Amino acid sequence: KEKGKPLMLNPRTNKGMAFTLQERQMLGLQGLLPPKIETQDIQALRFHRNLKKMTSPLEKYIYIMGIQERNEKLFYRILQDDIESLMPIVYTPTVGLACSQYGHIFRRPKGLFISISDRGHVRSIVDNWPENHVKAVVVTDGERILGLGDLGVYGMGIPVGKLCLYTACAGIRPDRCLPVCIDVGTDNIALLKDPFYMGLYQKRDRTQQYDDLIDEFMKAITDRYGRNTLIQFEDFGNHNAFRFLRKYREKYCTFNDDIQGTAAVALAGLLAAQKVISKPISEHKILFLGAGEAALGIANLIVMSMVENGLSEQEAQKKIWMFDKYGLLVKGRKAKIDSYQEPFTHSAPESIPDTFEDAVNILKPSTIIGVAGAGRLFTPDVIRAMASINERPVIFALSNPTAQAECTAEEAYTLTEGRCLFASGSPFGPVKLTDGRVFTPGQGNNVYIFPGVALAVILCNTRHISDSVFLEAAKALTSQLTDEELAQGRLYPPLANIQEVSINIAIKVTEYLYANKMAFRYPEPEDKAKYVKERTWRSEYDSLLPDVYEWP
Amino acid sequence: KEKGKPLMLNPRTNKGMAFTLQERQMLGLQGLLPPKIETQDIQALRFHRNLKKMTSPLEKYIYIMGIQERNEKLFYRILQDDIESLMPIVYTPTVGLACSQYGHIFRRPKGLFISISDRGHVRSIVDNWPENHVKAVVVTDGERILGLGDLGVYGMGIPVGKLCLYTACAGIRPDRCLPVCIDVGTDNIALLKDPFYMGLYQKRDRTQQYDDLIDEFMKAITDRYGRNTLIQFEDFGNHNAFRFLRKYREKYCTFNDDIQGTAAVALAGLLAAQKVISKPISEHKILFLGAGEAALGIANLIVMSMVENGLSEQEAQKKIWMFDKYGLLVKGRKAKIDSYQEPFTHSAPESIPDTFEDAVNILKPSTIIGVAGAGRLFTPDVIRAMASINERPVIFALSNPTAQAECTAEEAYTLTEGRCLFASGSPFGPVKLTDGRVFTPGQGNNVYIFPGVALAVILCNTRHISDSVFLEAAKALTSQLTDEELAQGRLYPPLANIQEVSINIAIKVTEYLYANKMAFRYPEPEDKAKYVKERTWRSEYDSLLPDVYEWPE
Amino acid sequence: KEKGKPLMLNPRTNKGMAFTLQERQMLGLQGLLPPKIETQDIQALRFHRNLKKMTSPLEKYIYIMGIQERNEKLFYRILQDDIESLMPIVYTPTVGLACSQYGHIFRRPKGLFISISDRGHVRSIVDNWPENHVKAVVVTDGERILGLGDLGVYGMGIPVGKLCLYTACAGIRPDRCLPVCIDVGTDNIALLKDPFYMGLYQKRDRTQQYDDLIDEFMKAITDRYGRNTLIQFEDFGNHNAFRFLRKYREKYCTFNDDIQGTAAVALAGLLAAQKVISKPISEHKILFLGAGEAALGIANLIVMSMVENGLSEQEAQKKIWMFDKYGLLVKGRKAKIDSYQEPFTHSAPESIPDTFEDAVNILKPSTIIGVAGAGRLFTPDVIRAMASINERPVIFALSNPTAQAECTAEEAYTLTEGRCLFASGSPFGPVKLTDGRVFTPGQGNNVYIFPGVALAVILCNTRHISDSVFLEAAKALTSQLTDEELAQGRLYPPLANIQEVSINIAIKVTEYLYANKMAFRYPEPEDKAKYVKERTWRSEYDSLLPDVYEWP
């Protein structure tokens, strides 16, 4: 398309000093670059050297995210070199810190910004996006960014970082990814007073106009790019998150990772546990600390797993209890019970606990899952009560970051003599016990699911994503534990091999999508594995050398 | 020319969030920016707030040079806002530290790279340069980067930084500035071992090819851009610096800042000292610690300044003495004598000095100038020796960085008890003696000279720069001091006013060029002040809004 | 700058099928062109073949002017191949015919259009012109297009065609040429009723606004491109033409070809004649048929020639009489005498003619010059009266086109036994007389002057063009007649060698410009010939091949 300085200024084309001598000469770059040819390998090492001479995580974020705006293929190469250590940077927890000071660290814009001031003109904006074949859209209003609450347009970092992991893990063409931020104001007074805030100076609009903007946004996106365009909602308010999932679910090809992706990884760990504890599902009793979107999201998907294994809906629900901030979810309590909690709000026992430890002793659960985000509430005695009740208790401490976790690997494994099966939201290191026996805990990271699922949905031209897709993703993830990894005490495969794990998920989800008539991409491929591997985006530089030859 | 995302990837047009609502809508940026209209001020305050979060100078270099590549108008606004503090960052000393690791911090390339491997195809390379009306070239081989020696292609940071100051100070259009690095190899072993070295992995070619390559380079630039294109040689090795300056002085529009710019700023101080103490020029004698590039440069220019005032050639030279690392330069000594030094190699006194303190006592100088870059060799006893020999002694400690300076301001002013006239290369804060008097010493930075001179040479379409230009530039620098500032012991205007000072220098040089028939820009302007002040480049954002207006139906 | 289809769509870069194999491969053109390499020679022949299979002049114009918008270098090559025959097409007379039907034949726009509706916004328009270093501007209001009168914006063809001859003859870089049309309405009712008219539907504005538009236009041009920018006025109303020349002459670097260029070629022929008739200038009496801009233009320049040869102003004026539509210009006549005619309005004789033949017998002129544009008014007996009075009478029939000429070569040479010295505005073929003696008449074409002058003015950064520049151009033109050409009866060199003639004029005018301190381009060149030849624009294709080589 273009030659000269424009090639170097365009991230998609810019190879940097990896432009070969001929490329330089033939594309009019000779002299604009230093007289040295590099490879993507040399360029990558240079990054790792600079990254080592940096302590601050926020400095690492700003550096690496700058590389995206200079050389795209280098950027995604660098993530793929060591994804485990850099995923903390490009996404959580660091992305939170970046999102807090997002107006300070701003350098170059990265996504698409739709305001409530642009009401009725969303189509004009969408059309300004240079890329023509968008497949994956990630959107946020910024109201519920991680644990940091409302951050307005500073939330844009989340879409951006999310889509980095789409490309990095799954192989979704970056040029077909679109991060979107919906600015309708913000209730965060700190930001309104900040003169470097990048959003609108007004409180959140919660009128009809907000709903209308989302409708128009959804329409505008699909008008330009198609109805099969994948649209993921991220870090919306809990109220908005659920009701928008409901009203668009069967209309637009949309999912919510915070609900559905979270449920999937939760379940995938439970299913990993059942390769150890083979107890009939009839026996499993499950107790959630917290009754948030995370709880309800996970709860529903468990019920659906239980249903596919024999149990009814009514019965499977009665095997799930929830203990939130006001106490145990029971019928006829003064504390509020919302519509989504009603199915898990159960007939009260004789003794009605006022403590979580009290509940564990009364209800005799085989599994406790922590999603309160309210610190260390799985007390040492809670851990013990579970070890007395179950021979191998399943304890899931999912809250993030580490400081909000309900308990620690250390705290879990040692207080149950290394019997329990543990998994966490935040990364804990190998625990060592006094008998010289190693236990390597797994991490319940959402990145196990959404990339693979997203690739499959896109590759199959799927138009709606049913809850049973995430159920199939769960089974798919769990089916990649080797025996060794289970012996070591992992309920998830290593994050190190996320790329491979993401693909195999995409494959197994593609098969399911065709088998249940949710794929509209025909002709149907016979070998789904080949079909997926072939279409994943590679970070290797392509030649940009024009073809010169003699005429014989 | 362009619309959409290209306007934001092009730093000459990119206003960032300073794009108005009208501009965003009409240019198709609406939605690509956050919904927040800023101004150049807010953007600037953001930069200032973030600069404080950084502690390392090198972090700051990387952050600020980054802005040149995102937003050019914003970049030069940031420099002009706080020029005094950020000039250390953008250029010396921090550019030295950056130049050392230039390949380790490389993100985007900034200039034009001509290797020896491109011999015969140099015009090809010149023609790849996007800009069509280049007026100012700064070129480096990389052989003698500051006091760091041979950094080779790492030396590119020097031209890049220096042209920032052309623009920042004098208002020379950035799009007409071309930084160039001639790459002929490097003698530095560490770099030849480095897998991130950005140059050719070979020793410096010192053969005939090197000379040919510089010839070809000079021809190629002036072919494309014209013969009056200003070509400034920077940080070449001594041998080459002088010989090329001689070879091209009369053929192209060229100068060397390390020689001629240094001389101008040196002389500017000496003349300002002369204003304080009306010492007859016959009753002056100059002692240089060091007899290299800086010494020889300042020497040759001083001679002219004396000759101008009445002295002859030989007369003025005999008032200038040089003491190098082998000792005092005297006729028929043991250590060798370069031909440029020969004029300042006199017949030995009766007692040949073996140290510098000796020389001060034997020769009884009025002024010592330190350009050896070898630490605190103006020992306390030397400052005292001068303090007793002269009523008002002039002491110039020009060596950089601070650690290689011959003495501090504190050391100079206390051991002379206020009676000293002091200047240095490195910045020394205010010196407050016990008795109550405060002395603010002048910094003898080259940046006083080269911006103003370059601007003048360019606006007058001058084809050659004789040494009298720098002489005339020196007087122009000296003449901007207030009497109050002379009473404060300043021999140089504040760096806070480098802009006002650079323009005023450019004006006076313009008058000189026209008055002495060295200008070729006719018709000749009458008011030279208005001419210069009108052609300076501004950092204020231009509107990119196309004109919408109504036609009678 | 650019590669691919854009190179082929850009006239300045487009070489057509003359793109070499390597160029095609290296610039991404391989496949977009037919598999055949041509030269500019092959491409040129193709043009000449097509031009031969066309009768209509208007078809030839549309074809060749299309080539300018496809391949610029080919276009100017083709003019330089046979300039003599094609100059009739690109300019007069055909350009007149094209200008009449300009809205019909419109295909692609060619110049810059400034309307009175764009009052106060002329700078915006000027800035829309893509070219950055304009040197030669030709502008028209369209009020007095050739003989066709007011044609409004259809007059744009004139600037365009004029500037074709700038490039074709002189070598003025086409990219530095700017044709401008000032639309202020038109009095031509035929055009106002035409629904394909390309100008404004209103009568000519003759208020202050017109004058103001011209001021702003002049300012805007010079603001962007400089005060030394050459601005030529063409085919303005006679009133406007003179007064605009006067008020801007010493302000903007401006000339008018219809006045000054016309005067120059007139004089150059008179000076050619004086190499035959060596009579002292004191004896020369001159009589103009018509007292138009052409008459007055020529008259003044003659006076200035006479002055440089010894005569005073008052005396030199008395040697010039004028006979216009109302009769002989005499003091105290009922017919109007304008300010410019006053110097040539003389003390009445005893007998005051009412016929032009009557005047020739009374006043005894040695030279008659026809610029009435009113047909054959040099009656056969006029021709004879001149032959009886003078041994070699100088008869100049300058009116155009041929039908408006005052007499013919045939009519002139035979009615004076082949004694007279004749020149015409329109081309007449070699006359043959009954004694087997050939007389080849010259043409008083303005193209002899303005290209050479224009090149010199531009190359010398001249800021004002004095009348004595055109006087020097005249002497320069005449100094290129060989003796043979004078023997044959030519008062001008062949149009065939206009390119060479234009350059030599530019050289001699450059020398004069430096010698009289009108050049601001220093350093001054020592050899003016080399200086000019070096800087003329060539039509040869340049290589567009990027430099590829090995690294030794």
Ligand SMILES: NC(=O)c1ccc[n+]([C@@H]2O[C@H](COP(=O)([O-])OP(=O)(O)OC[C@H]3O[C@@H](n4cnc5c(N)ncnc54)[C@H](O)[C@@H]3O)[C@@H](O)[C@H]2O)c1
């Ligand atoms: N660069 C190329 O050579 C190129 C590029 C695109 C398509 N094609 C050709 O077109 C055929 C059909 O391609 P298609 O795109 O219409 O359908 P497809 O069968 O190749 O892909 C199905 C769907 O998945 C999307 N998709 C595929 N890979 C993706 C990725 N890495 N990231 C995001 N979205 C991705 C496509 O846009 C499409 O909507 C291909 O089989 C190939 O022959 C070639």
Ligand SMILES: NC(=O)c1ccc[n+]([C@@H]2O[C@H](COP(=O)([O-])OP(=O)(O)OC[C@H]3O[C@@H](n4cnc5c(N)ncnc54)[C@H](O)[C@@H]3O)[C@@H](O)[C@H]2O)c1
């Ligand atoms: N590991 C993962 O993949 C993953 C994914 C999503 C969310 N999470 C984590 O889940 C946690 C909850 O997120 P959420 O979106 O459900 O938030 P939420 O506000 O919707 O849920 C919080 C719930 O905890 C309850 N609670 C608060 N303090 C309590 C206390 N002291 N005792 C008992 N109950 C208490 C609240 O009443 C509420 O029911 C967070 O810490 C978040 O980091 C983890």
Ligand SMILES: NC(=O)c1ccc[n+]([C@@H]2O[C@H](COP(=O)([O-])OP(=O)(O)OC[C@H]3O[C@@H](n4cnc5c(N)ncnc54)[C@H](O)[C@@H]3O)[C@@H](O)[C@H]2O)c1
């Ligand atoms: N302040 C300014 O504007 C400015 C401008 C240019 C140069 N300088 C300074 O000038 C200094 C020298 O630069 P240069 O290019 O002339 O270097 P150079 O290598 O050309 O000259 C060094 C000279 O010092 C002599 N020398 C070295 N050690 C000595 C010692 N111990 N005692 C006596 N003489 C000794 C050497 O023999 C030689 O003659 C540097 O420190 C540099 O910072 C300052």
Ligand SMILES: NC(=O)c1ccc[n+]([C@@H]2O[C@H](COP(=O)([O-])OP(=O)(O)OC[C@H]3O[C@@H](n4cnc5c(N)ncnc54)[C@H](O)[C@@H]3O)[C@@H](O)[C@H]2O)c1
């Ligand atoms: N393509 C090239 O290589 C190229 C192009 C332009 C200039 N140059 C270099 O710049 C030097 C100075 O060029 P300059 O233009 O400033 O001055 P110049 O001395 O070459 O020309 C003087 C003036 O005439 C104009 N001019 C020259 N040739 C012309 C033409 N054919 N048509 C119209 N206008 C014409 C110029 O624009 C200028 O205003 C040249 O001597 C050359 O070294 C090179």
Ligand SMILES: NC(=O)c1ccc[n+]([C@@H]2O[C@H](COP(=O)([O-])OP(=O)(O)OC[C@H]3O[C@@H](n4cnc5c(N)ncnc54)[C@H](O)[C@@H]3O)[C@@H](O)[C@H]2O)c1
């Ligand atoms: N050969 C050239 O280079 C050249 C250049 C310019 C104009 N011309 C020709 O000159 C002629 C006049 O052009 P102009 O611009 O001076 O027009 P104009 O209207 O200014 O001049 C016409 C003059 O002829 C007079 N006239 C008209 N009919 C007459 C008659 N029957 N008897 C006597 N006088 C009569 C008018 O009164 C007026 O004085 C045109 O035919 C034009 O083609 C030739």
Ligand SMILES: COc1ccc(C2=C(O)C(=O)C(c3ccc(OC)cc3)=C(O)C2=O)cc1
């Ligand atoms: C309301 O309190 C919350 C709720 C959810 C979160 C999230 C997480 O705890 C995640 O781990 C999380 C997440 C982390 C990693 C990941 O793949 C890299 C995907 C999601 C989120 O998106 C969250 O919103 C944080 C605080």
Ligand SMILES: COc1ccc(C2=C(O)C(=O)C(c3ccc(OC)cc3)=C(O)C2=O)cc1
């Ligand atoms: C040989 O040792 C040297 C020689 C010269 C130098 C230079 C300086 O000491 C400068 O101050 C210097 C300089 C510094 C600032 C400036 O304007 C900001 C211009 C020149 C140079 O270019 C040098 O080369 C340093 C060490």
Ligand SMILES: COc1ccc(C2=C(O)C(=O)C(c3ccc(OC)cc3)=C(O)C2=O)cc1
């Ligand atoms: C008013 O009647 C007129 C006046 C002038 C003309 C012109 C000519 O007769 C030209 O020859 C003429 C011209 C012709 C050729 C040329 O070089 C090719 C330059 C001018 C004009 O520009 C005229 O305006 C025509 C009719």
Ligand SMILES: [Mg+2]
């Ligand atoms: Mg989230």
Ligand SMILES: [Mg+2]
């Ligand atoms: Mg230097």
Ligand SMILES: [Mg+2]
């Ligand atoms: Mg005309």
